[model samples]
Target: LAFPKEFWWGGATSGPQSEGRFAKQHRNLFDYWYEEEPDLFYDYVGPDTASDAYHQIESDLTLLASLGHNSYRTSIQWTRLIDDFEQATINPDGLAYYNRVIDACLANGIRPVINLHHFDLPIALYQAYGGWESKHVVDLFVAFSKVCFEQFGDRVKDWFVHNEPMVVVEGSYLMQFHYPAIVDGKKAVQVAYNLALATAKVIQAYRRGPAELSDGRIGTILNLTPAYPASQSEADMAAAHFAELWNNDLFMEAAVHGKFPEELVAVLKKDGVLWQSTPEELALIAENRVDYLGLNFYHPKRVKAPDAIPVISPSWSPEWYYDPYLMPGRRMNVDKGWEIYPEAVYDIAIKMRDHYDNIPWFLSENGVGISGEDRYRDETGQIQDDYRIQFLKEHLTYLHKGIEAGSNCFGYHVWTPIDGWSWLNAYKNRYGLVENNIHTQVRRPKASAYWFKKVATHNRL
Candidate 1:
C-alpha cells in the first residue's frame, strides 16, 4: 500500500541549472547562445550565477541531508571534466570538485544519482561538429562518459546516461528552446538517432568499467508524456498514436528495446525525413541496453486530429498531423502553464506495465514551479508553499495507487532540492523545496522542505 521497502526519496538538480561560476572557465552551448544574443534570455540573465552552487555545495548538500534525502540526483559537467574537448583530457579541478561532492554526499548519508548529460553540451563539440548532427560526436560523448565512470564509478553507483535526450533534439531542432535553433525534420531525426547511439555506447562503456561499477546501475531519464485522444473518433485515436510515436515511443523504444519502432520508421519514411544509419550502429544499440529506466512525468498530452496536411517547405514540424487539445475546464498550473493531471501518473505506470514488461523504473523528476514565492512566506520567514506540498501529495498518492496495482516504480525524486537557475526562463519560476536568495546567494528551507523530510523519514505520507 506504499512505496518499496527501500524507496529513494530525494530531489534532483543539474550542473548547468545549479552550478554557476564553473561555466566561466568551461563554456557550454548555453553560454555560447547567451553571448550570441543576450536579449533572447529572460531578463538578460544568463547562467553566470546559477544558484551559486559552485561556492555553496556544502550548505546545499547539508540542507538536502536535513530533509532525509536518501538519494540526490545531479549532473557532472562534461565541459568541466574535459580540459580540451578535442583531446578529451580530464581536468584536475573538475575531478576534485565532483569527488568532494560525492564524498560529501556519503558523509551526509545521501546517495548521489549522477547523470552524464543534462542538455549542457560542450561548446567546442557544438561548434566543431554541428552538435549531435554529426555521428563523430557519438565517440566524443562515449569518451566523456568513460572518463566519468573511471573517476567516480567506485563511489557513485547509480548513473544515468542522459537526461531526456529527446528534449535536446526537440528543443534545438523542432521547438527552438535550445541552441542552434532550427526547424528541420530531417535534422531532428538525425539528432535523435545520434543521441540514441551515443547513449547506448555510453552504457557499453559503463558496463566495461571496473567491476566495482557492476554494483551500480546505468540508465537514462525520459519525460514520458502519455498521449491521449480528445475523443474516441478513429482519427483522434490515430492522431494520439502519431503523437506518442514521435514524442514518447521514439527514444523509449530505442533506449529500452534497443531498436527503432517500426511505426516510427514508417512515419519518417512517409515524411521523407528518414536519415541514413549503418546496420552496425543499429546492432550496437540492440546489444547494449540500459540497466533500468527513469521516467519524469510532469503532464500528459491531449491531442486531436489535424485540420490539413502541413506543407513542409521552409521548415518541417510535428504539429501538422495533430493539434494540441486543451480540455475544457481542466485544472491548470497557472504559474507554470502546465496541466495538473496527477491521474496521468497512474495511467503512464499501467501503460508501461502492459507494454514494457513492468521494467524497473522510478519517478526521476516531478514538481511544480511557481513565481513570486515571497508572497506565500509565513510570519516566521518560512515559505508556506502548501500548493507545492499538495501537488506532491496528489501526484505521489496516484503513484502509490499504481504500485498497489502492480506498477514497478521504486522511488520519487522531486524536480529539485534548491531553487536553481533555469534555462531561458532564468529565475522567474522557482521549483525548489528550498528557497535561494539570488542576490545574497542564501539558501533557506521552505515549508515543503520540512514536509518532504517527514514524508521521507516515514517512507510514506
Candidate 2:
C-alpha cells in the first residue's frame, strides 16, 4: 500500500537486447552466436533486430515517460561504444546514439541508470583475449568504462558495472547456456574471479575517473536468488550455505564489501579449482566497493547435498557440494515452469537489513514472462493482463512489507519495458508492459501499463 515518497517506479531494458546490431561498428557475442548457431534461437529470432531500439530509443523513452516512469535502466553495448579494443577508440555513431538516449531520458523527466555490461561482451575481446578469463580483456573493459564515465557521468546519475555477473560465470564457463560455452570447472572459477576483479576495477575507475558526482552513485547488479534449504537437516542446510557462497556471496561480497568470501576460496582450493589471483589484485579489491547495489530477484533457489560429482567427468562442477531440491506444492508459473514466489522479495530485504548492515540498494528487476499474451487482447484493443497486474501487486506487497520492516531499498524496476528480443528464448515468451508489434515496429500499452501508471503516479501500490 505504501513506499518512499520518491520511490523509482520504472523498468529495465538493455541496449544490446533491445538495440539492433545492423548500424553498429563492431559485433557482440550475441550477434556472433546467432550468426554461428541460428537454430539455437527460438524460431531463428536472434539479436539482429531486437525491437530496433538503436533507432527507436528516443521514441521508446518518450513512451516510458508517458507510462509514468520516473526512472529507467539500459546498458551500453561495449562493441557499439568502442571501435578498437586495444586502442580504446570511440565510435562516433555509437556516441551520438547514446547521447541521444541520455538526453532523451532527461528530456522526458526520467532518470537514467546506465549499465556498462549485461553479458554483451564484444566478439573481438572474447576471440583475442579469452573473454573475462583474461586480465588483458579486463583492462580493456576498464579503459572502456573510463570512456563512459568521462563522457556520460555528468548527465547520468547512476551507473552499474555489470548486470547479474553470476549468470556470466555460470553461463559461459560452468554451464553451456551462453557464448564461449564450456564446462570446465577450473576455468569457470578463473572466469568468475576475473569478473569479480573486473567489477571492482570498473567501480574503482568510476570513482577515481570522474569528478565528484554528489548527485550520482555507482554499483553492480546481481540476481540474488535466496537459496532455501529443503529441511532443517545439517546436510541440507550445509548445501544451501554452499549455494549462497558459490553464487550470491562470491560476487556480492566482493562488489559490496570488496572481498570475496574466504570460505568460498577455501572450497575452491579444496577442489583444486581456485582461481589465480595476485595479492596486489586482492588488495585493490579491498580498497574499492560499491556505493549502492541493484538486485534482480524473480525466484528462490532450493538446494540439498549432492552425493558426489556425477561420475561422468572427474573434473569439478559446483554440484560437488550442492544439488537442486524440488519443493512440493510450490506455486508454479506453468507458463514458464519457474516458481512464482513473491515472498522471497521480503526475505531478501530482511537479509540485507540484518546481515549486510542495511546496504542501500534497489530491486533492479522483477517481472513475469507469460507466453501468448496476444490471447488477452480485448475487443476494445487493450490487452487485458489482469494476471500481470496481480503478479506485480503480489511482489510489491511483499516489498512494501519489507520497507515497513526497515529494509534500505529505494526503487523497483521490471525486467523490461518493451517486448525486446530475449536471448535464445527469443520472443517465445513476452515480458513487457508495452507490446511491440515487432514487424510493424508499432507499440501499444497493455492493461498493466495503464494500471501501473496510476500506481507510479500515486507512488502507492
Candidate 3:
C-alpha cells in the first residue's frame, strides 16, 4: 500500500521520560513521586538518568536520522523551562538545553513538532494553587507557552498545546494512577475543565506571538482510546456512546470545535460534578479551537454497562457509566494486557472524517512494547524485533485504507524510535525501533529500525 507523499514517519516522546529528571530548579510531579516512593517504580528504577538524552541529544539525533526520519515530536517540560512559576522566570540552563535539542533536529534533516506539556506539571503549582483545578494555574501555563514561542517558536514550525491533556484527569484526579492520587469526581471535573481552558488560552497566546512563530500551525495531541461495546444491546450501545463522550469527545470537542459536548455537560451537571466556571472562560475555549490534532492510539477500550455500581472513597467517579470487560478470544498484548485491534485506526479515521469535518491530523503514536526485550538480541548486538515490524505493517495497512477514504491524515509516527523510561513502568516494556541499552549507553538499531527505514523511505508497505 502506498502512503501519501511526504508522509511523516518518526516518533513521539517527552522530556521527563527521555531527558531524565534534571536541569530544573523545581521538581515535577514525576520526580516528586519517584523520590517519595522509590519502590513504587518497576524494577526499582527511577527517571534520574533516563535515555541520557539530555547529555547525548546530539548522538540521539544522529540515530534518529539513521532511521530515515524526516519528522519527529517531543516536548518541553514545564518544570525544566521555568525557574520561578510565580514570576515565570526562564531558566538559562534549561532554555539553552532545549535550544540545542531544536537546532540538532533541524540540522539533521528533521522537522520538529514541539509540544508544550507532556503530563509534567511542576509540583509547586499543585501545592500552591491546586494544579489544573485553578484558572490561575491555567494562566501560568499560557505565560510559559509564550516564553517557548518567543524563544524557540521562530525556528520550530509545528507546535502542540499539550500531549494527552486528559491523562491528568484520568491518572491524578479519578483513577489514582498519578500523583495526588485520588478518586474524586468533583476534582476530576474541575481539572478536566481547566485543561480544556488551558488549551484554548495557549492556542490564543500562540497566535499572538511574533509573526514568524504565530504564523505556524498549533494543535493538541490526544490519546483517544476508541470505546467498543460488547453486543448490539441498547444498554451496551449507550454505554459505549457515553464512554466515548466522557473519555475522548470531552477534550476532542473542546480542542477541535471550541465547545464541550452538550450531552457531557448535562450529565456532569446532573451528577453535581460539573466544574464551577465563569462565562468568560467558557467563551475563551469556544473562540480558540486548535488548528490540527495528534492521535495517540495504543489499545481499544472495551467497556460494557455495569449492572450495579460500587461505592468507593469518593462514592463517584468519571468511570461510573461503563465497566471495562475482557472480550473472549480477542487478540492481546499479554505482557501489557492490551487488546490488539488494528481496525481502530480506520474507525478513528472515519469518525474524524464524518463527525469532525475531516480535521487535519496524524497518527502521532502507535507501537508495541515487550518486557525483557534483551532476550531477543542477537550476537551482533542487534535486537531482532520482527514483531515490532509486523505490528506496524498491520496497522499501517488500515491507516492506508483510512487515508484513501479521504481521512485527511498526513503522517504516521510510532510511540518512539528509541527506548525511553515509561514512568512507573520504567524500562519494563521496551517500545522502540532502536534499542536503548540503559546499562552500556549503547544505542543500536533493532530489526524494526532497518525495516522501518525502507518503509519510511519508500512511503509504502
Candidate 4:
C-alpha cells in the first residue's frame, strides 16, 4: 500500500531463523535453550540443525526473483561475523556468506534489505558482558555496527540497525523468554536502556558515515500489536491506553521522538524501576531518531483488566496491567491458532502515523503459521497450501486501506520466504510458501507459492 513504482514483493527470513549452518560454522552463545534442559521452548526443535536455508538459498532466491519480487529481506548473524568478544578478528567466511546472498539477489534483480541483528546474539558476548543489559554491551554493539558498515555497506543499501531493539533488552532482563533469562525489573530497565543507547549510537554512526560509507539506511523494527478494549466502558478504554503504552510506546517513542512516554516513565518510577544511561546516551536517543519505522502487525490483542490484580509470573514476564481477553466472533486460524483480524492492520498504520510523526513506514513482517502437514504427497509428493493465500489476501486488503489513508507506507514483505525456525513456535506454525523437507533436503512449492508468484508478477491479486 502506497508503494512506489516497481515496489518490493518478496518474503522475509532471518539468518538464525532459516540458516541451517548454526553449529556448523560457530556456536551461537545466545542459543542456550535446550529441549532437555529445565527450560524448553514452547515448540521445540533440535537447535536449528536442519533449517534448510543453507542448501536451498540459491533455489529460494531464484524462486523469489523469478516470481518478480523486487526486494528480499534477511539478517546477518552477528556471531557469524565476529567470533570473539573483542571484535578484533573478522570472519571472512561470514562476510562471504552474506556477500554471496546479496550478490545473488542483485543478480536476480532483487534489492536486499538486511537486518544486522534479529533476536539472535552471540553467546560469547552474553558470557563476556552480560549481553544487552550491560553498558558494555552498547559499546560492543557500536563496534559491531561499525564492522557491518565496513564490510557490507558497499553492496547493501537497505540495512536495519536492530530488529525490535526493545526486545533485546526485554528478552534478557524482563521477559526472560529469550536467552540469559534474568527476572528483575530494575535490571530489565538497564537492559532496555543499554539497547536504546546502542541503537541511538548506531543510527548516529550510520547517519554520519564512518570513514567513507553512506549507502546504508539504518532503522529499527518494532512489533506493534494495536490493543483494543473488550468493551466501550471507561475501564476497558483505559485498558487500551495502558496496553498501548506497554506494548507500542516503549520502542517507538525512544526511536521516533527521542524520549520515553511520560506515562510509561511514571509507572516505571512508581515501581522503583529505573535504568542507568549516560547523559550522552540519552541525548543521542533524543538527537538521532530513526530515519524510518518498520512495523510488524499481526493479530490484535483484546484486553481487559482481570478480576484479580496482576502479578509477574516468573523472573521475566511482561509487567501486565490487564489480562488478555479474546474478542467476540474473532476469526481464528485453527491450524496455527492465530486470530484473524485484518482491520487491526489499518488501525495500527493510522496510530503509527499519528503517534510516530508519520515517518515513512514499511511492513516489516506479516504472515500466518499452521502445523500438522509433515506429510503431503502428490504425484511427486508436493505439499499444497491455500490457507496462507487466504491469510495474505485478507492482510493485504488492509494494507491497501493504510495507503488510502495517506500513510507513506512503502512495501509489504511477508514474514518468511522459506519455512524458518521461529523462536518458540518452532515447526508448529507453517508460514512458508515453499516447503522444505528436513529429511531429504527437498524444496517444494505449496499452492500459496503460485498465488504469491501471480501477485508478484501482476503487482496485485
TM-score per model over all chains: 0.98, 0.98, 0.98, 0.92
lDDT of 1 by residue, 1-461 (tens): 45789899999899888888563457788877887887887788788888888888877788888888999999998878788766678898988888878988898899889999988987788788988898778798898888888899889999998899889998899999998887888899989889889988988888877788667889899866788899999999999998898888888888889998998898888878887889999998999887888899888789999866655456666677799999998899998778899999999888778877788889999999999899998889999999999999999999998898899888999998999888888888999999998889888899999999999998887
Q: Model 2: residues >4 Å from true position, as ranges?
A: 210-215, 307-312
Q: lDDT (0-100) at residue 453 of candidate 4? A: 82
Model 4 regions lying over 4 Å from their true place: 1-3, 22-25, 35-44, 174-176, 210-212, 310-318, 374-380
lDDT of 3 by residue, 1-461 (tens): 89988898888898988887666677888888999998989988788888888888888888888788888898999898888887788999999999999999989999889999987898888899988888889989999999999999878879998888788788887777789887778888888988999999999999877788798889999866689998879988888889999889999999988889999999999988888988998898999987888989988888888867776535467567888878999999899998899999999998889888898999989999898787887888788988889998889988999999989999998989889899889999989888888886678889999889999988889
lDDT, each prediction: 0.86, 0.87, 0.87, 0.74
Q: Return the lDDT, model 2, position 270.
A: 83
Report the lDDT of model 2 for residue 130.
84
Write model 4 residue lDDT over 1-461, tens digit each, in one string.
23456656888888877876643345554355553352365445745554666556777788788766789888888777775657535777777777778888888889988888887776766777777766777777788787778777777778787787667666766666677777676777766666667778888877777545765567888867777888888887887788888678887888889987899778777776766656777788999887786788668778886556545444423435766888667899776566899888888778776777788778888888877666554566666666678888888888888777876777888887767777765666767777766567566777777888888777776
List of clashing residue pairs for candidate 2: none
What would the per-residue lDDT of candidate 2 be over residues 1-461, giving only the tens digit for each residue?
A: 87898898899989878998867988788889999999999889888888888888899889988999999899998989888889889999889988998999999999989899998898888888888889999999999998888888889979999999889888887788889887888888998888889888887787776465434788889866799988999998999999988888998888877888989999899878899999999988888788888999878889988866465765677777788888999988887888888999999999888877798889999888888888989998878989889988899999999999999999999877898888989888888999987788788988889888998999988
